[model samples]
Every structure is written in C-alpha cells, then in structure tokens.
Target: GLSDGEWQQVLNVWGKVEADIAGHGQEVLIRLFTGHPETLEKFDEFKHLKTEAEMKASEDLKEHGTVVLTALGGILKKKGHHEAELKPLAQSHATEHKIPIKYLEFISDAIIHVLHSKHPGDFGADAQGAMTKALELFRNDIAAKYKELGFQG
Candidate 1:
C-alpha cells in the first residue's frame, strides 16, 4: 500500500492523465501517470498491446466513432441523465437501424468496460446509465453525420 502522500500523488497523476486522454486522445501519455513502479510496468505492457490492436484495426470509422462515443458518454455523465436519456435513444436507433435492442445493450456494455478500465474508479448506476445513453447518442450522431456526408441512408 502507498503512504498517504504517495496515494495523493497517484490520485493526482490519475486525474491529470484522465484529463489528458479525454482532451488529446493520446493514449500513449498514460505512461506518465503511473506513480508506482509496478503500475508503470503494467502501463507499458498495456500500451504496447493497445497500440498493436490499433494498428491491426486501423479503420477511421471505428477510431473516430469511439472518440465521439466517449465524449458523449462524458457529457451524459455530467448531465446525470444516464438511463433515462439512453432508453429513448436506444429504442429510436433500433427502430431506425432495424437491429435488435440487444446489440445496443452489448455496445453500451463495451463502452462501460472501457470507461471503468481506463478511469479506475466507481461509476455506479449513474455511470452505467450515462454510458448507455452515450452509446445511443453516438449511434445517432454517426448515422446523422453519415447521412449528411451524402452516404446512402
């Protein structure tokens, strides 16, 4: 366990890196946030794996989609409109896309997994609801963008 000062340092670093990742989309900078030696090692390993995965699946649509989705989730979390906001969007997206609602739920779960793993704190029910709302928002946002860009809808 870390001493009180050390724990504070950890929290500070985590907060800074979280902000950086949200603002700049530079996942590599996360290495600077690991206060402990062990965590630093783990961060290095995780970065390599994440980078390779990014390289392997270098699709602009997927990459930008994730970034937009994350930002939307953050917004929904701030608004405290998690589940309430998400339920309607999910129904709307499902109806428009002709896809099952379960797929929407699965996508929401995936985003929540990323939020929990990257943020390293408890999000609880509000976070979960916000995440779902965010995913639905993402789907709708992208669909509209695609349509606007002259893609066949």
Candidate 2:
C-alpha cells in the first residue's frame, strides 16, 4: 500500500509521460527484449526479430506495446480500484499467452527504467518505490488468477 503522498507522486510522474504513450511503450518493450532476450521467445512475432531495429520496425510490436502501455495507464489511473479491470488481462495471459508469472517482475522493472529515463527529476526514490509496490500488487493479482487456473511453470 502506498502512502497518499506516494500515490500522488506516481500520478504526477505518470501524467508527464502519458502524452508519449507509444514511444515509452516501445522503449520499454525494447528494453525487456534487450535486457532479457529469452522473454522474446514468448512472443512468436517477436522471437524472429534479432535486432533492435527490426523490433522497432515491427508493426506487431508497436501495436501490442501500445496496448500494454495503455492498459498500464488505465491501471495507474484507477490505482486502488483496479482489480476488476485487471481480471481479463490476468485470464488471457494465463490461459492464452501462458506467460510465466515471473515476467511480471521483469515488466515492472522495465516500466521503472522507462520512467526514470523519461522523467529523471520526477521519478525520485520514493516515487519509484511506490510504482514498484503498485506493480507488485498488479502482478500478485494476476498470479492468483494464474494459480486458480491450475497453471504451473
């Protein structure tokens, strides 16, 4: 749980970057693939793209990355009132994508990295901590659904 001040800081920082949603999204996804190459295997469309240029040029990557960042934006907007909204996402990732729950941590870290790079002044230690906590909450909820489905590994 974030303190009221922490929550406000997160909203303020997020608002700054929301305008360039696609760009930030693309960067974060690129960071994910670059930082953890194996994660690309989860995406059939992305696995074949061996270079950052190829990844950046991918229409599929752009579209999916935008959708993901948009979802994150919504989740940030709602904050405490997000569980209901996250259910379908959790279900799809678990049942359809079969994505390992661990990747949520990777995604969270990637988001923080993007935030820092985009707004170094605003994303101070406290704000970063708050975002980390919020993302963990989101990940935990998804992991619960994944577990409920008897999905393992």
Candidate 3:
C-alpha cells in the first residue's frame, strides 16, 4: 500500500514528468526495448523495430509508450483509485496478450532509469522509493486483473 507522505514525494518531481510526457515516455521505451530485446515484439506497433536506431525512429513506439505513462499518470493522481481504470488496459497487456509479469517489469525498470537520469536533482532516494512503490502498486493491480480474467501467468 502507498502512503500519503510517499505520494507527496512523487508529486515533488511529477511536474517534470508531466511537462514532457511523450518525449520522456519514448526514452523509457527505448531503454526497455534496448535493455530487453525480447520485449520489443509484444506490441504490434513496435514489433517491426529491429534496431536501436529504428526504435528511436518509430513514432508508434513513442505514442504507445506515452499511452502507458499517461495511464500511469492518471492512476497515480488518483492514488489507488484506478483499479477499474487499469483493469481494461491491464487485461490488454497481460491477460489477452499472453505477456508475462516481468515483461512489464522491464518497463518499470526503464521508468525509474529514465526518471532518475532525466530529473536527477528532484529524484532523490525518497522520491525513487516513492516511484518504485507506486510502480509496484501498478504491477500488483495489473496482475490482479490477470488473475481475475483467468488467463496467462
């Protein structure tokens, strides 16, 4: 469970994330796809990206990544109230698509990396903890929906 204080820590730097959602999101996807080559094929929009440079050039990748973060931003804003909000997308990601939990884990890792590197000053240890916790909550909700739908593990 996330705390009020923890949520405050995230808000301290969320402005920067909100400032340029798509660009930051693209960087995150680039990092995730580059770090975990197996993940690049999960998304139909990004399935064609064969190289790092090609990934950087793919507009669909950017848009899709932005879509992910946009969902996250709203979920975080509401603080544990978006279980229903997340259920459909979560079903889409893991249940219907046959994607694994760690597949999304790669994306979570990429988010921390991108946020830490891009907003070094605001993203201190506390903020990092907050971000990680929120991501865990997100992952939990996604997995919960997967369980409810009675699909892939």
* Candidate 3 global TM-score: 0.91
lDDT of 2 by residue, 28-142 (tens): 8988888888788889878998678989998789778888988988987787678888899988888898788878788889999988887778678877887888888888888
**lDDT for model 2:** 0.83
Q: Alpha-carbon error at 131 in model 2, in Å?
A: 0.9
Candidate with the greatest lDDT versus the true structure: 2
Clashes of each: 2, 0, 0
TM-score of each: 0.34, 0.91, 0.91
TM-score: which is higher, 1 or 2? 2
In model 2, the runs with Cα more than 4 Å from the true position are none
- Distance (Å) between predicted and true CA of 97, model 1? 2.4
Instruction: Evaluate all candidate structures by whole-model CA lDDT and list the values in order.
Output: 0.42, 0.83, 0.83
Candidate 1 backbone collisions, by pair: 82-129, 82-130
lDDT of 1 by residue, 22-135 (tens): 332323223222222232233233333343344234344244444644554454433433444444454444454444333434444544555566667654455455345545
TM-score of 1: 0.34
State the weakest 10-residue window (summed lDDT) of model 1: 28-37
Q: What ranking of all candidate models by lDDT puts the best one first?
A: 2, 3, 1
Q: Write model 3 residue lDDT over 43-95, tens digit each, in one string.
A: 77677896879988878888987887888888888777877788887877765
Q: Candidate 3 — which pairs collide? A: none
